[PDB]
Amino acid sequence: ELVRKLIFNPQGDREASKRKIIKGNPTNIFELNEIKYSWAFDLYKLMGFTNFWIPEEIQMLEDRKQYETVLSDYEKRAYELVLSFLIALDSFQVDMLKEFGRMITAPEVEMAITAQEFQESVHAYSYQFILESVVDPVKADEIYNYWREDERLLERNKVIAELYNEFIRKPNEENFIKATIGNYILESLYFYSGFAFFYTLGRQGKMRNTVQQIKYINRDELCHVTLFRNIINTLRKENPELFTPEIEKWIVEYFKYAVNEEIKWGQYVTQNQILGINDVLIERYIKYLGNLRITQIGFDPIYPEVTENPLKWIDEFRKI
Amino acid sequence: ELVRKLIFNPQGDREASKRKIIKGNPTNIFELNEIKYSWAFDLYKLMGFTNFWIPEEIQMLEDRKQYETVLSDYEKRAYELVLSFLIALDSFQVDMLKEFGRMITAPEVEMAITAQEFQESVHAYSYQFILESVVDPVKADEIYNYWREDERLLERNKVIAELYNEFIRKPNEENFIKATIGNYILESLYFYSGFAFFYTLGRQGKMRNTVQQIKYINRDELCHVTLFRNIINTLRKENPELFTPEIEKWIVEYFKYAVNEEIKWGQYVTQNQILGINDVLIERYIKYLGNLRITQIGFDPIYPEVTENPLKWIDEFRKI
Ligand SMILES: [Fe+3]
Numbered sequence A, B: 001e002l003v004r005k006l007i008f009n010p011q012g013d014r015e016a017s018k019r020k021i022i023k024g025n026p027t028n029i030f031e032l033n034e035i036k037y038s039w040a041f042d043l044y045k046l047m048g049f050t051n052f053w054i055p056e057e058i059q060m061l062e063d064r065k066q067y068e069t070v071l072s073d074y075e076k077r078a079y080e081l082v083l084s085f086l087i088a089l090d091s092f093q094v095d096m097l098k099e100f101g102r103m104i105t106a107p108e109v110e111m112a113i114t115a116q117e118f119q120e121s122v123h124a125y126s127y128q129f130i131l132e133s134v135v136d137p138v139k140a141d142e143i144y145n146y147w148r149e150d151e152r153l154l155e156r157n158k159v160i161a162e163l164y165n166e167f168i169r170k171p172n173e174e175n176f177i178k179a180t181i182g183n184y185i186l187e188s189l190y191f192y193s194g195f196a197f198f199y200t201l202g203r204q205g206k207m208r209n210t211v212q213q214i215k216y217i218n219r220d221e222l223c224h225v226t227l228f229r230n231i232i233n234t235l236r237k238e239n240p241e242l243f244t245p246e247i248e249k250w251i252v253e254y255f256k257y258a259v260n261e262e263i264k265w266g267q268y269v270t271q272n273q274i275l276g277i278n279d280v281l282i283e284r285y286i287k288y289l290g291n292l293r294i295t296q297i298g299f300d301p302i303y304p305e306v307t308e309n310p311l312k313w314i315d316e317f318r319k320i
């Protein structure tokens, strides 16, 4: 079991050089005059100060009209499904990041995760503002609760939980790597059917207010992916005993599964009824994301057939 | 034992009205369209958006000079002791607030605590910036590590930990109320010898840069005290079985002890060698704070002899 560190360890190492992501021997004073993990402190500053944003300073005068009239029945169904799921995801994230933060022994990394946890809270605030602004009170509740109706949404949610619940029940080193990899996958993939969709509506001038909110959320998710990419790669070097062949295998499995499921969710939401998104065009996106993120944490591409981002336009569109 | 909630509960209550601070039955989706605890959501917005601040946007060109020359040997000793302790406190806070947040079943309250945890991270950043700006690299390390030299500081730290460690080891309902009350006390009292001191130097135009940083930190601590005052009072109404006479007694004890110790720390730091602070004038401050905060959580004044703030000038000086 990963023994959760005492609030203060007077027998703790003074040398910042002796810090470890996990299983270190810190004082648990945030001795930030010496930083071992420069990327953790930089990412704290970027998430906490540089990229700071206020969801209510984004004006939402247009979208309530476009929803009521201009949007098709299929476009409203998607909007509902995507926002319901992203509300689920960010909710799981604010809660699970408290688990990671309390197990990590490097103060600069703990700081980066506190900043991440806060950004996840701002997202929860952004979605509440989107629904308060765009739709009516009953519809807003319905969207928050759309897992209660839709089995493909409910199962999406129970699945993401299960992997996080393994670590909470059995807080061992194996279930920590799993939970960490799951966090990276959730941040890597599970936002991007949703992001691609909203950026599609925005390409033809639909829900450009919601899309503004999304650009800010998506800027945050890149930093989060960047934070956990560094954490996984640093855990490789510092704890190679934990990356057994059984784990190295399991990582490739879940990543392939996750790419598969995100694609299908992308298809169940759109269904070729959205002017810009094809059931095929979803694949080449999620497949390119999978390769990008799994190779970035030191693996072989899991879909070598794909070696090009189909939606390259996004990278310029998403920008602020 | 307070069973830490699963990541997702499909058997969770839909009705925001059924939420509890602890031992509720939530879905753990942040259903923020309905808010039971209006004060929690307001405080989130105030801490997260309204009161947002960047420590590095405060200029620190003056204090490095005033430290090197203008400051007495006693004034430098105090500066060192106070900052070392506040670094300890805010470090304990970022870590312990992850414990509270993961045990609380009301999403709006969990949100407020995430915002609090983030503000605690910004304080850790502020102190690192103060020491990077004001003093030299060896002195900066020495101040971070001044518990290693000074037994009155080391014991101050081990004591605050012990009460938080009780709950982490034995996460039962009794040790939760204790930890919660300890958090309120730490936020109520333990900052204010430090704040009074810095605001004293600032009254005679000493370390006005450090004092700017402190005003922002102190604005945050008022919201934190306000957040946990509401949490304790809501816990009284919702869980009166937990406020046994044994607990109601223990609360009055620790609060009197805490007022006593903060006063002494105030005296060990200053020692009547600081132009504005008397060993007596410390008492009437901490005694007035004690009464203010313990009555605000529904108790009888613990020092009826005192019924006036000696340093009323602070309330206008601390303002931004
Ligand atoms: Fe995220």
Ligand SMILES: [Fe+3]
Residues within 6 Å of the ligand: B093, B120, B187, B220, B221, B224
């Ligand atoms: Fe605080």
